[PDB]
Design an enzyme around this catalytic site. Structure first.
Site, PDB file in Angstrom:
ATOM      1  N   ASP A 152     125.261  -6.686  60.343  1.00 29.34           N
ATOM      2  CA  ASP A 152     126.147  -7.505  59.209  1.00 29.34           C
ATOM      3  C   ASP A 152     127.086  -6.420  58.483  1.00 29.34           C
ATOM      4  OD1 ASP A 152     127.441  -9.763  58.007  1.00 29.34           O
ATOM      5  OD2 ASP A 152     125.808  -9.993  56.563  1.00 29.34           O
ATOM      6  N   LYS A 154     130.476  -5.221  57.048  1.00 35.32           N
ATOM      7  CA  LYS A 154     131.820  -5.743  56.740  1.00 35.32           C
ATOM      8  C   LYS A 154     131.950  -5.224  55.299  1.00 35.32           C
ATOM      9  CE  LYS A 154     129.346  -9.650  55.039  1.00 35.32           C
ATOM     10  NZ  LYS A 154     129.099 -11.347  55.004  1.00 35.32           N
ATOM     11  N   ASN A 157     129.543  -5.935  52.278  1.00 33.87           N
ATOM     12  CA  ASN A 157     128.320  -5.515  51.988  1.00 33.87           C
ATOM     13  C   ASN A 157     128.030  -3.840  51.867  1.00 33.87           C
ATOM     14  OD1 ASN A 157     127.388  -7.749  52.491  1.00 33.87           O
ATOM     15  ND2 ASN A 157     126.525  -7.464  54.726  1.00 33.87           N
ATOM     16  N   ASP A 170     122.414  -5.956  51.692  1.00 29.61           N
ATOM     17  CA  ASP A 170     122.116  -6.849  52.595  1.00 29.61           C
ATOM     18  C   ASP A 170     121.782  -6.626  53.728  1.00 29.61           C
ATOM     19  OD1 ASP A 170     122.497  -9.722  52.859  1.00 29.61           O
ATOM     20  OD2 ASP A 170     124.499  -9.530  53.178  1.00 29.61           O
ATOM     21  N   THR A 187     129.174 -12.090  60.804  1.00 27.54           N
ATOM     22  CA  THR A 187     130.271 -12.657  60.133  1.00 27.54           C
ATOM     23  C   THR A 187     131.329 -12.718  61.287  1.00 27.54           C
ATOM     24  OG1 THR A 187     129.867 -11.357  57.848  1.00 27.54           O
ATOM     25  CG2 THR A 187     132.022 -12.381  58.478  1.00 27.54           C
TER      26      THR A 187
HETATM   27  O1  LIG Z   1     126.314  -8.264  44.292  1.00 22.62           O
HETATM   28  S1  LIG Z   1     125.587  -8.058  45.596  1.00 22.62           S
HETATM   29  O2  LIG Z   1     125.191  -9.020  46.505  1.00 22.62           O
HETATM   30  N1  LIG Z   1     127.048  -7.295  46.199  1.00 22.62           N
HETATM   31  C1  LIG Z   1     127.087  -6.947  47.565  1.00 22.62           C
HETATM   32  C2  LIG Z   1     126.633  -8.200  48.607  1.00 22.62           C
HETATM   33  N2  LIG Z   1     127.948  -8.486  49.325  1.00 22.62           N
HETATM   34  C3  LIG Z   1     128.061  -9.907  48.963  1.00 22.62           C
HETATM   35  C4  LIG Z   1     126.915 -10.682  49.331  1.00 22.62           C
HETATM   36  C5  LIG Z   1     126.434 -11.509  48.209  1.00 22.62           C
HETATM   37  C6  LIG Z   1     125.176 -12.507  48.439  1.00 22.62           C
HETATM   38  C7  LIG Z   1     124.466 -12.767  47.215  1.00 22.62           C
HETATM   39  C8  LIG Z   1     123.117 -13.619  47.560  1.00 22.62           C
HETATM   40  C9  LIG Z   1     122.850 -13.909  48.831  1.00 22.62           C
HETATM   41 BR1  LIG Z   1     121.337 -15.005  48.986  1.00 22.62          BR
HETATM   42  C10 LIG Z   1     123.778 -13.533  49.657  1.00 22.62           C
HETATM   43  C11 LIG Z   1     124.620 -12.722  49.761  1.00 22.62           C
HETATM   44  C12 LIG Z   1     124.439  -6.695  45.551  1.00 22.62           C
HETATM   45  C13 LIG Z   1     123.423  -6.704  46.485  1.00 22.62           C
HETATM   46  C14 LIG Z   1     122.504  -5.622  46.650  1.00 22.62           C
HETATM   47  C15 LIG Z   1     122.465  -4.459  45.493  1.00 22.62           C
HETATM   48  C16 LIG Z   1     123.542  -4.504  44.738  1.00 22.62           C
HETATM   49  C17 LIG Z   1     123.758  -3.229  43.822  1.00 22.62           C
HETATM   50  N3  LIG Z   1     124.629  -3.176  42.769  1.00 22.62           N
HETATM   51  C18 LIG Z   1     125.757  -4.211  42.794  1.00 22.62           C
HETATM   52  C19 LIG Z   1     125.683  -5.458  43.766  1.00 22.62           C
HETATM   53  C20 LIG Z   1     124.659  -5.516  44.612  1.00 22.62           C
END
Ligand SMILES: O=S(=O)(NCCNC/C=C/c1ccc(Br)cc1)c1cccc2cnccc12
Lengths: 336, 20
Positions: A152, A154, A157, A170, A187
């Protein structure tokens, strides 16, 4: 390297076999703000009241994971995440669950998504892109060594940390697989032809995805785009790529190799493995050791103003956490 | 320009993952 990875396989294997469980409760954290959203959950900036620390807590709705038939994938995610350990992967700090959801409290990466900066900035200079490539190169070299496929890649992520370094989040499609695999995953813009062509695949999809990444970074847009995914898949399987006039020749030729439809000719998938890439002309200036040590000059540093600062993330509507009086999908998630 | 062609399109924002 081979020695390093060698020691590395052993800690992952121990962890693989005895994955950890329920390392916390909801009420030890203070919910602060949604940082991202998705099909069946949202990631929240959360504060650990006992330590005064901040983490990103992922909240998966059990019922929605089931409706979307994503149980195995969710299980792979938590199992692989608690087992790995590398400088460019986000750390899983805790996991627990309740009657209603599943939780993964990871490390809060303050810099925001790569996606966000690249969109705003437009495109990255080769040197800036290469800084980031090298980091996914090693990360894949580690991942694959453990018989894992990331699946995944992109900009959305990849997160930027205080030091201007990458943090891959992710692992919802990450899978430990020896041999071919078949799920249509990922994606659209990043799918390898084999995947769209329903023909079973291996790690080679991770090197084609990297080839796409480098392209979207240096040029500012994907090598294959259209308004609907069917139009994109069509382009991907055509094996026809146009390169921006500002692409160096070395970059055009790294990309020709990485974006090879013929996977018996695709870099990363060949006899010499990951060295074909690490030894490519474009990368000739990269000090992989210095980069693994985080001792390289970071081309960009998103600066933030203190803990809990969430100004590098977009705003999302706040949905309220609801936890049932009745345990929801017990059996399906018992190993979580 | 391809850049123009890209900005005018439907997938400039955050791309979602294809499940089923
Ligand atoms: O907010 S995040 O999800 N940012 C990167 C993820 N890219 C977009 C995906 C969002 C998403 C959220 C919930 C589900 Br279920 C699936 C995708 C995110 C995920 C994991 C650790 C993180 C640490 N710091 C900031 C953000 C973090």
């Amino acid at each position: 390297v081979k020695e390093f990875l060698a020691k590395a396989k052993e800690d992952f294997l121990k962890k693989w076999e005895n994955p950890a469980q329920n390392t916390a409760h909801l009420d030890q954290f203070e919910r602060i703000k949604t940082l991202g959203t998705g099909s069946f959950g949202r990631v929240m900036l959360v504060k650990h009241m006992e330590t005064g620390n901040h983490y990103a807590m992922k909240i998966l709705d059990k019922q929605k994971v089931v409706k979307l038939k994503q149980i195995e994938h969710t299980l792979n995610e938590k199992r692989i995440l608690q087992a790995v350990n590398f400088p460019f992967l986000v750390k899983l700090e805790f996991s627990f669950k309740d009657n209603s959801n599943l939780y993964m409290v990871m490390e809060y990466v303050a810099g925001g998504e790569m996606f966000s900066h690249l969109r705003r900035i437009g495109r990255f200079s080769e040197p800036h892109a290469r800084f980031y490539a090298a980091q996914i190169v090693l990360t894949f070299e580690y991942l694959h060594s453990l018989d894992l496929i990331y699946r995944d890649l992109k900009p959305e992520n990849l997160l930027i940390d205080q030091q201007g370094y990458i943090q891959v989040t992710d692992f919802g499609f990450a899978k430990r697989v020896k041999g071919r695999t078949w799920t249509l995953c990922g994606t659209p813009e990043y799918l390898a032809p084999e995947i769209i062509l329903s023909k079973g695949y291996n790690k080679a999809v991770d090197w084609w995805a990297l080839g796409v990444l480098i392209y979207e970074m240096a040029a500012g847009y994907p090598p294959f785009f259209a308004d609907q995914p069917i139009q994109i898949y069509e382009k991907i399987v055509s094996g026809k790529v146009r390169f921006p006039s500002h692409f160096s020749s070395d970059l055009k030729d790294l990309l020709r190799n990485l974006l090879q439809v013929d996977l018996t000719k695709r870099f990363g998938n060949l006899k010499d493995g990951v060295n074909d890439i690490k030894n490519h002309k474009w990368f000739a200036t990269t000090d992989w050791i210095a980069i693994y040590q985080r001792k390289v000059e970071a081309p960009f540093i998103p600066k933030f103003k203190g803990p809990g600062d969430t100004s590098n993330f977009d705003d999302y509507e706040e949905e309220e956490i609801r936890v049932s009086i009745n345990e929801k999908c017990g059996k399906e998630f018992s190993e979580f | 320009t391809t850049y123009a062609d890209f900005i005018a399109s439907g997938r400039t924002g955050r791309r979602n993952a294809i499940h089923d």
